[PDB]
Amino acid sequence: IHFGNLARVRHIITYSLSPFEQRAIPNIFSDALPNVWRRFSSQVFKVAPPFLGAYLLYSWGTQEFERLKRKNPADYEND
Amino acid sequence: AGGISHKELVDAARQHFSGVSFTYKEDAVPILPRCRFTGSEIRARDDAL
Numbered sequence: 014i015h016f017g018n019l020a021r022v023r024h025i026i027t028y029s030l031s032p033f034e035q036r037a038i039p040n041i042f043s044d045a046l047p048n049v050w051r052r053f054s055s056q057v058f059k060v061a062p063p064f065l066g067a068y069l070l071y072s073w074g075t076q077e078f079e080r081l082k083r084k085n086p087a088d089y090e091n092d
Numbered sequence: 093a094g095g096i097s098h099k100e101l102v103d104a105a106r107q108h109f110s111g112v113s114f115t116y117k118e119d120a121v122p123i124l125p126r127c128r129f130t131g132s133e134i135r136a137r138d139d140a141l
Contacts, residue, residue, distance in 0.1 A: 023138050031131030 038045070113119055 021139050023140055025137050027133075027135045027137075029133055034131055
């Protein structure tokens with residue numbers, strides 16, 4: 014059991030329609046996509062940053078490592 | 093309905109239910125615009141009931 018002992022709720026009316034009287038994926042453009050953007054927008058700056066900051070560290074350390082393999086002529090201008 | 097003569101009744105009507113119609117539109121029983129049914133729900137919650 015679990016439905017009916019949940020919480021004290023008063024004065025709230027809700028209206029909904031049978032799934033067959035409405036659209037499965039309504040307002041894809043006018044409503045849908047805009048919010049998809051809204052949301053993307055909202056987070057982009059909390060998420061992306063540290064990810065990009067890692068990418069650098071990756072690229073840097075990754076190449077710096079390669080650089081340590083190549084030879085430095087300044088070791089042989091001595092013979 | 094009861095102990096009444098259709099006659100004596102139909103007459104009383106003729107007498108107090110006069111006002112005859114001139115045009116045809118007065119004899120026109122207007123048809124009503126259809127009401128559309130919709131599978132849905134309304135929930136009025138009050139746990140205090």
